[PDB]
Amino acid sequence: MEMGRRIHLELRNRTPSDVKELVLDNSRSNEGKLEGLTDEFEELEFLSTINVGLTSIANLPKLNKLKKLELSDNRVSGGLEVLAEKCPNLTHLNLSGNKIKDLSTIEPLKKLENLKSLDLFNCEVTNLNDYRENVFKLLPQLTYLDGYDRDDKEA
Amino acid sequence: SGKYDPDLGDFKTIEELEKLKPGEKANILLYQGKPVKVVKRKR
Amino acid sequence: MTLAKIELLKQLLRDNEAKTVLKQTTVDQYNIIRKFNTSRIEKNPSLRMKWAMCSNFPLALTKGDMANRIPLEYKGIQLKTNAEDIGTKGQMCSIAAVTWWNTYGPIGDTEGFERVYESFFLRKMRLDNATWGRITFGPVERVRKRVLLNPLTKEMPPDEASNVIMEILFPKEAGIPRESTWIHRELIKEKREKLKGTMITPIVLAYMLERELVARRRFLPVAGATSAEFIEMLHCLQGENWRQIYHPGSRSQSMIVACRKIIRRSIVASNPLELAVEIANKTVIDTEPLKSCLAAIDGGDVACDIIRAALGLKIRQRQRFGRLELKRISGRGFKNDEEILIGNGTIQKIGIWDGEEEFHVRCGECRGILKKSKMKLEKLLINSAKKEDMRDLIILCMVFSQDTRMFQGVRGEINFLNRAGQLLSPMYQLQRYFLNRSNDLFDQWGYEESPKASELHGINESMNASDYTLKGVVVTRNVIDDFSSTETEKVSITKNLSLIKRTGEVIMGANDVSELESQAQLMITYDTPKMWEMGTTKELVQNTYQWVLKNLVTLKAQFLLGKEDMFQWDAFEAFESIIPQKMAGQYSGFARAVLKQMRDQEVMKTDQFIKLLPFCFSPPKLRSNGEPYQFLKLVLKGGGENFIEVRKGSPLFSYNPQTEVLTICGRMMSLKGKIEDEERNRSMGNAVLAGFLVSGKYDPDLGDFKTIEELEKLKPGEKANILLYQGKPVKVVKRKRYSALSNDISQGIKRQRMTVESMG
Amino acid sequence: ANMTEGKSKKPKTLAKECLEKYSTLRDQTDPILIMKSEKANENFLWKL
């Protein structure tokens, strides 16, 4: 199975601007990328990339309608500033299970202002003193986190 | 709004009360043996 | 070879004797024909083998092309000869060629041994990883017991074992699969897949499977554990004057609980037998009906024995009274009604046994011999096994003996019932009274001097090995071995579940079962609404989801039609009991709207369909305007963890599509995927020639016969010409459904009794 | 967690109530082994 097969199954061989969500899960990728998603995409709301072996974020269509994106179980470790230049309209961010070394990796999210929830589970950065407080004062725009900002609501 | 109804479930902690939504009914406990049933209000 | 087969057949028929015998003896009679061998068995195998090993070519090689791999003489050593043979019609050879083959020659495949000889390698694994301990040189007390020599993958009776073996490794000759392949479908498919890819002779595999399935049991002297794993090593573990510590490298409790629940459910109603058997054969334990572990173990709890009697199975004919297992030794007791005053002052009319009798008595780990006369216990010999078991044995034998002292020792009252609320006979009422208050007849029974002797030593009322024992009771420091001649004699079953001998005598009563509740260590999934309206909400949800899952094909087919008849199913009525009354209607309306949307504007999604279907049993209550209410969290009775998540999953229900698995009430089940493709993968076991019924005779209109692979090509409802068993041409029709004879019989009985009651 | 008024109760009753609240974990009978010690036996520990 490949990203192309998932794209064909979800789109069912139709125009790219017909679905506002994608499910790219359990898909092998060339050197850890997210190919199979052409830049021609114009409308997209939800994303899902799990067990894709994504190692970096360097290929992504420019978008202005996406609000949620899901990355998990990946060895990606690099600056995410490119998201601002690609789609500065993210509201739900999920990095659960990813591999991030230190706090500097999550710095480039400051320039994004629409993010309200960020998820980081069993991450090497999560095991630090005052990581919760340090992240909060580092990303003032954030309104939610792993789930315990002040209360518990569901996405 | 009512009285103890085991069917609705056990007593709800403040954590669930704070995250509740209007128009939903819950159960609380004043002290041992005097439970009560309450409902959230917009006002 | 088939041409060689036909040529050999023609040559054999050329003689008139072959023609007359072949055309005379039917296929069934073939067995007799085979047994007419010379039987000139060697008188002394040792001498024969010794002589043969010194002969030039004792080995009898089968004619073939293998010999060309090896010369008739290698390195100046004679190996094989080209002289003809009369005994086997092959060639002759010597162990020299065998050793050379072990040295050089063709190299075979090593895969087959990984799985084919699974039992042997499992034995080796259990030996290697075992942990040894100290050795206790002191004397060891051993009891003779009927033990299973070797562990079994799935114990089954010999006939079922043979049928399963044939269904596994003999795809042909599989006419009309019985009511045994569906029970063992998982074993069938597992062994079929494992043994595929081999080239060993089929008879070897058949014998190995027989060893792996058919049970082997024997009388052995054992002390301590008794599972087959320990019996394998009994030769090293045990010892007359030495013992070793050994730890080799469940369903029972669940079946006990299920049988007890079935007994309690059926007793309260009239005609308990039919209802009990319906529930028993409609029950399942995680992969199989209850006739997969009941038929495995020998005997068991009284409830299991009664259920087996209700079903078709063999039960040990020991007399169960409360917990006592009694085996008569001699004497005949005349059961005559008599009026006896009880110690409480009341007078009861009950049956008493005139005449002397003796019984081997067992209870848990306690064994003994009891000798009783009418209205009196005479003698009791026991071994020290356990305080609880010894007390139970003493009290139960006391009550059974109907000793006048036991009656005069009553002090309270006898008006008890069972969990079903029924008044029992005075004997069982007294049993319960004395067991509840053990220190009632013990105090006033009277004491007897200690058994002054080399080994015979007494026991006091407190069960401690203390002298000044009870009148009659004696504890011998020896081993009492009892319960011989387990004939499994013919036993009848009355409607009220109480068994009786070939004569009118009663062996097991409906009330022998003890009213003790436990927790099923496994998913006890039934198939009848009547049963599961007892337990907790979680059990109800699990059973409803299992009912939905089992008959997924029918529900999925009815979904396409789009009619409300699909939703008005009795299976969900019990579910209605665990949904809040004030809000169930809104759930039903919301789920109905969601499922209508699913049918209209999207495609199949099994997980959400299963999740949302059951809540629609109750009538809907739409919004004032008319639109359905919307929810995302269905609350259930008990609150807290008893709640369903509409979106992805919850504690009671969570389906993961990455691996396509289903977790219900903390139990993982494999939904390979969706689609009739996954339906057929579920049907990947079953049995060869299971989708075809028999109808008509040869009917040569179809010409020659067709294989199973070509049989599948025919569309449902066609007619095909096939061979059944060893020949027997017949005409078959491909089935359009899956059948269950037990369900049909149960429904017929239900209709019959409904008619009887309505006329009455 | 199991919210309580504040009364003192025997540890056995507290454990029983806590397992009742999380009934799913209590009724787990099929263990999905994830890691094993060099010498310890998983079956014995699970049965215990």
Swiss-Prot record, chain A:
Q: Which keywords are on file for this protein?
A: Cytoplasm, Endoplasmic reticulum, Host-virus interaction, Leucine-rich repeat, Nucleus, Phosphoprotein, Repeat, Repressor, Transcription, Transcription regulation
As for subcellular location, the record says:
Nucleus; Cytoplasm; Endoplasmic reticulum
- Residues that the record marks as modified (Phosphoserine) are 17
Every copy of the LRRCT domain together lies at 123-155
Top-level taxon of origin: Eukaryota
- Positions carrying Phosphothreonine are 15
Mind telling me what this protein is named?
Acidic leucine-rich nuclear phosphoprotein 32 family member A
Shown segment, full-protein numbering: 1 to 155 of 249
